[PDB]
Design a protein around this ligand. Structure first.
Ligand SMILES: CCCCCCC/C=C/CCCCCCCC(=O)OC[C@H](COP(=O)(O)OCCN)OC(=O)CCCCCCCCCCCCCCC
Ligand SMILES: CCCCCCC/C=C/CCCCCCCC(=O)OC[C@H](COP(=O)(O)OCCN)OC(=O)CCCCCCCCCCCCCCC
Ligand SMILES: CCCCCCC/C=C/CCCCCCCC(=O)OC[C@H](COP(=O)(O)OCCN)OC(=O)CCCCCCCCCCCCCCC
Ligand SMILES: CCCCCCC/C=C/CCCCCCCC(=O)OC[C@H](COP(=O)(O)OCCN)OC(=O)CCCCCCCCCCCCCCC
Ligand SMILES: CCCCCCC/C=C/CCCCCCCC(=O)OC[C@H](COP(=O)(O)OCCN)OC(=O)CCCCCCCCCCCCCCC
Ligand SMILES: CCCCCCC/C=C/CCCCCCCC(=O)OC[C@H](COP(=O)(O)OCCN)OC(=O)CCCCCCCCCCCCCCC
Ligand SMILES: CCCCCCC/C=C\CCCCCCCC(=O)OC[C@H](COP(=O)(O)OCCN)OC(=O)CCCCCCCCCCCCCCC
Ligand SMILES: CCCCCCC/C=C\CCCCCCCC(=O)OC[C@H](COP(=O)(O)OCCN)OC(=O)CCCCCCCCCCCCCCC
Ligand SMILES: CCCCCCC/C=C\CCCCCCCC(=O)OC[C@H](COP(=O)(O)OCCN)OC(=O)CCCCCCCCCCCCCCC
Ligand SMILES: [Cu+2]
Ligand SMILES: [Cu+2]
Ligand SMILES: [Cu+2]
Ligand SMILES: [Cu+2]
Ligand SMILES: [Cu+2]
Ligand SMILES: [Cu+2]
Lengths: 382, 382, 382
């Protein structure tokens, strides 16, 4: 939730999430779900979004209904912010543990500093069980195993209640006497010195000394109880390993790209050159989490969110085997209610009417090439 | 105009504009002139100029004597700011349309954010005709063809005059009575409440209600008249395609570079190694829009501004065919009044006495290699 | 001095200084000492240190006990700040001239803007002689040879004394009369106009006119005496040539890296793959200026500061010739008091417990390969 309201061109021109898998659709409490996939950083990064020099891989959900057990970018655990390069592709994996029952829309997201949220496709996952069964065991380097759900709760309650009680006692010591009107009149009359006695001064001295001594003793006792402590671990982790992918033996030029403004579709003229890899055929156009597929060339079998999957939303004028070398100019039409449901038609309000997306080409043997396209998008009103 | 006053080293060390062409020297009104060429970004970019992450290709002229019909960087239209990389070469093309008659010095420039203006060579172009004949037709996506010279002029005049008249009427309603002295005396005397009557309150209420209602009705009518509107299109366009140029089979090392301070020339010792490409010969040294040529090796036939063209300003101790492999140390002398006219001799006031420029080598067949040189420049006073 | 107090991980993860040489250990006054070596910029640059876009090569010493005659980065003199790229290796050379007698700990350092100091290994150098024998001759472009120790000293003294005397005379002219109490009483009584006479006004006018005229005449005389002047030369020098080094035919993966917190050592599990270059053997681990060596494989003969040299501080479970192709998992133990002396054990207070260093592999013929390792460092308390 939160993507439909984001500018259409910003969603089109930031990060592209390609083949994704979810290990389970329905999980029990304390069971783990794995979300893997690839994300590509668009070369034409918008200028109002800072470059992903400081980026964090996040899980979009209405709260800690899951707990993120681990997250890996390129096989490396990433508990901190990371640095990503423009134009590179990265594998990502996220292992989550179920905490609260219910149906949850879970998304993979990249939070970018100086940019904001970049939400990926969301999937509905059902958690069955009771929240009381959730456990979060962690073993420390000191040899102690604790449960993070209730660890250190009683100590915090005790100390906060103790200090609150001390403050309440300090206020109530003075609250046993007339408070506001008689004291104000006495101060106005010049009898302020009569409002504080020697016993009050001794009580204040005792309160101050007891507070300081208790703080010192509590710090000493806490140090004795936990002689081994480390500061909070923070920093930006550089040197993320990107994917070394086969360059596309397929070249695609966008002649024109238009959308009818009333409109639930997008149309584009494309010149495609096959540089080998056998006769190929376009099977899918990915724009903003929406996948328009050509049923005759490719069929999704990964449980891609159906609200974002158009099984026959790709209409190519001529989708015949493009013999290696053939340069065919084709008119592709990406049509689906998701265009209007995911407010991609709101590119009419955007201060930049340019789109970007991914095209997937398959040969007879099923090998897939990914081609990256970007162009300006012209609205049609006649 | 405006380059002679810019620091000599800043002009030497930012952008180099090489082979340029102008389609016409004399044009009529509404006729188009094309300026094409190449620009190279110097690797040793000055630190006080921000990197050209946000750069705009501009035309330097005393105003809209021309209108910039289009501009292309690497074959791509660039109506917005673009991103350029240090050390890369780009083709540029600019098509301008003549608007005002007269002789105009036209320059191609790169405005760089956090840096300032980078002016290129200027050429004198004559426009013959009358300004009243200039037309700027534009066809909108709604099917309307308009002339940008006078489009929406009457509407703006009408609305501004209407609101100015309303304000004048509001002031003049109160201006029919004594204004300053009697009213001031009455306010001082305590008779302020007598200065505003019930009729005045009713007039003020009517003015407020009429203003609000007129604004609302005008907005509704404007929306009805123009139901299709888009916001201003802005942004920085990345992914500019640079030139893939042959690396210079010629290696040049600058041993020493000196200039006499009184002085109208510059001298340099150079070690040149030919790595193939047949016997070569130096034909031209480009510094800051100034081209020093060796008449025996090369002759300009592009109409390069004569104030910046020194046909025999390159004197090479030995400019004989440098057999592939020969490593000759030569003393080159670049001499021309342009050195003093374009204030390149003002490098003596610069906080950085280092120069950069381009050397052009030609073989027997006429093939040209471009070598890029940079060195510190030492003034000579004895 | 000043490195032991710097965070251990910051010292481990910034710049690595490898093979270094000092021309002399004991020098006389006016004699020169050359310090050469290589420095590598770590790929995982810490986020709190700005990238070395503006870096200066500096000499760490308690003052001008030496004078830095020259400094070269990649064979190019670097009197100004320079730009360095992450992940590149550079040669550096520094020629210093002895000025003051005594024993001096001299370090090579890289000052990085927005980062702070990066100190390298320090060496003790003895200077014998008298400071009065030190000379700093410099020949100017005007044909004058001067000594920078005493040049322009007398002129500065004369002008400062002259202006101080003028100010003292101005104060003392008024100081001959009663100063504070009688004048205050007269001003309070309304007799302020009697405290300044016409002669005082004439004296003030003469002082003002003389000051302005003297300033103008002094400027004119200084211009006449030195008709050739240049501004201060400043700027950041880009285009530093890095080393083109053989990629390591040796691959090393860090399985685990741990240190006992009481502790004077560090332990690591490593998987090493030989990709040719004959049977190899680990001979040295460099962490933070500390070099742990395996005496049986390699011996230092460069006079590396002994406080930072552990001749037998590298213990490899199996350090037998790793036949090209062999993938052996070995347990290496780097032990030395320098770990505690140079406060590398203070990584326990660091907000980032990750280390980086260099491994040196030698074959039978003595050829050396450098492998770069980085991992998180886990403290052991049991
Ligand atoms: C829950 C209260 C709201 C917020 C409290 C915030 C800070 C505390 C303020 C007052 C503390 C001192 C009590 C008054 C002097 C406590 C005090 O003097 O009690 C005797 C009073 C005074 O004697 P008197 O002049 O002969 O009688 C006048 C009132 N009948 O008599 C009483 O019968 C008791 C009345 C006082 C009861 C108020 C207690 C509420 C405060 C404790 C709340 C603790 C929880 C805090 C978080 C919400
Ligand atoms: C690092 C330097 C210290 C900071 C400088 C200021 C220090 C001030 C000193 C007092 C100067 C004022 C004159 C008072 C003369 C001595 C003095 O302390 O008198 C009591 C004064 C009231 O002043 P007075 O009676 O008119 O003074 C005349 C002689 N008694 O109250 C206080 O000082 C505050 C309340 C009583 C203090 C008891 C200790 C509790 C507070 C400290 C914590 C102790 C427990 C430590 C935990 C381990
Ligand atoms: C061009 C004027 C300069 C700038 C104007 C700026 C804002 C407007 C100020 C005054 C408007 C109300 C007029 C006075 C009450 C208009 C008004 O009350 O006119 C009757 C006056 C007053 O009657 P009275 O007391 O019996 O006579 C005294 C003056 N003789 O009599 C007149 O004979 C007319 C004199 C007033 C003429 C001034 C008009 C100029 C202002 C309009 C300019 C519009 C263009 C604006 C942009 C420049
Ligand atoms: C979103 C919330 C609204 C903002 C809150 C403030 C609103 C204020 C309300 C009035 C409170 C003061 C008491 C007045 C009582 C009602 C009232 O409006 O009285 C007239 C008052 C003068 O006060 P009064 O006579 O002593 O009031 C006693 C009873 N009449 O003048 C005004 O309110 C201003 C001039 C007359 C207003 C006429 C409408 C023109 C202005 C609004 C635009 C209407 C056209 C819309 C275009 C589509
Ligand atoms: C070294 C002094 C410290 C700093 C000086 C800073 C600025 C100068 C202040 C005073 C200058 C005017 C002198 C007084 C009027 C100089 C002056 O009027 O001298 C005659 C006085 C006054 O005559 P009187 O009323 O009959 O006698 C009263 C004092 N006996 O008599 C004297 O016997 C001389 C006393 C004055 C000597 C003070 C001189 C010190 C200042 C010069 C220092 C220069 C070095 C500067 C850097 C440190
Ligand atoms: C660029 C524009 C200049 C700045 C504008 C202000 C200039 C001010 C002028 C004076 C106006 C006040 C009326 C005084 C009338 C003329 C005048 O200068 O009178 C003397 C006034 C005192 O005023 P007054 O006697 O009541 O004036 C009545 C007629 N004399 O003192 C001063 O002006 C200051 C002290 C005397 C000046 C002598 C010259 C020394 C200062 C300047 C440097 C000269 C040497 C140059 C070196 C090459
Ligand atoms: C959450 C836990 C709540 C803690 C509650 C603590 C109690 C707080 C205040 C008690 C007020 C009694 C005032 C009696 C003066 C009532 C009073 O003033 O009585 C006259 C005495 C006469 O004493 P004397 O013998 O003639 O002279 C002194 C030596 N003999 O004067 C005084 O000066 C008596 C001073 C006594 C002050 C006691 C207050 C100390 C409170 C510290 C509390 C510590 C916090 C808890 C620790 C875990
Ligand atoms: C650029 C175009 C210029 C537009 C010029 C607009 C004219 C402006 C002001 C007229 C002043 C007349 C004042 C008469 C009070 C003169 C006045 O006060 O007369 C006494 C009346 C008595 O009226 P009554 O009948 O006894 O009671 C009300 C119901 N019957 O009192 C009032 O309260 C009369 C109020 C009348 C106010 C009229 C002003 C409205 C002006 C709106 C202009 C709209 C803008 C143009 C639209 C395109
Ligand atoms: C470090 C070097 C130190 C320099 C010391 C300079 C001496 C400073 C002040 C002298 C005070 C004498 C005051 C006499 C008034 C004492 C005074 O006021 O005497 C009455 C005269 C009467 O003169 P008169 O003839 O009747 O009228 C004028 C034409 N004839 O009035 C005046 O107005 C006299 C004005 C004389 C002022 C002289 C002060 C000039 C000082 C400039 C110094 C230059 C700096 C050094 C250059 C290298
Ligand atoms: Cu959602
Ligand atoms: Cu992409
Ligand atoms: Cu010009
Ligand atoms: Cu260049
Ligand atoms: Cu030291
Ligand atoms: Cu390194």
């Amino acid at each position: 939730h939160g993507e439909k309201s984001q500018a259409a061109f910003m969603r089109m021109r930031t990060i592209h999430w390609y083949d994704l898998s979810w290990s389970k659709e329905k999980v029990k409490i304390n069971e783990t779900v794995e979300i893997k996939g690839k994300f590509h950083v668009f070369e034409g990064w918008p200028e109002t979004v800072d470059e992903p020099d400081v980026a964090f891989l996040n899980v979009g959900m209405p709260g800690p209904v899951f707990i993120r057990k681990e997250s890996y970018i390129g096989g490396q655990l990433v508990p901190r912010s990371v640095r990503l390069e423009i134009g590179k592709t990265y594998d990502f994996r996220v292992v989550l543990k179920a905490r609260r029952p219910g149906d949850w829309h879970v998304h993979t997201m990249m939070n970018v500093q100086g940019g904001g949220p970049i939400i990926g496709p969301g999937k509905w996952i059902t958690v069955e069980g009771s929240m009381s069964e959730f456990r979060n065991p962690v073993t420390t380097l000191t040899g102690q195993t604790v449960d993070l759900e209730n660890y250190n709760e009683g100590n915090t309650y005790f100390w906060h209640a103790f200090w609150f009680a001390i403050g309440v006692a300090w206020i109530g010591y003075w609250s046993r006497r007339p408070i506001f009107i008689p004291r104000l009149l006495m101060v106005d009359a010049g009898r302020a010195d009569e409002l504080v006695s020697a016993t009050d001064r001794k009580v204040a001295m005792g309160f101050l000394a007891a507070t300081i001594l208790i703080v010192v003793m509590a710090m000493s006792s806490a140090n004795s109880k936990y002689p081994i402590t480390i500061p909070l671990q923070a920093g930006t982790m550089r040197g993320m390993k990107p994917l070394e992918l086969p360059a596309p033996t397929v070249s695609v030029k966008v002649e024109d790209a238009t959308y009818r403004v009333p409109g639930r579709a997008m149309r584009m003229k494309l010149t495609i050159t096959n540089h080998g890899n056998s006769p190929i055929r376009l099977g899918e156009f990915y724009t903003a989490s929406v996948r328009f597929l050509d049923s005759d060339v490719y069929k999704d079998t990964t449980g891609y969110p159906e609200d974002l999957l158009a099984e026959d939303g790709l209409s190519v004028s001529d989708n015949s085997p493009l013999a290696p070398g053939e340069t065919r100019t084709v008119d592709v039409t990406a049509s689906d209610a998701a265009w209007e449901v995911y407010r991609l038609s709101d590119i009419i309000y955007d201060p930049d009417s340019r789109f970007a997306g991914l095209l997937f080409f398959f040969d007879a043997t099923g090998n897939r090439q990914v081609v990256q396209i970007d162009a300006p998008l012209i609205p049609s009103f006649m």
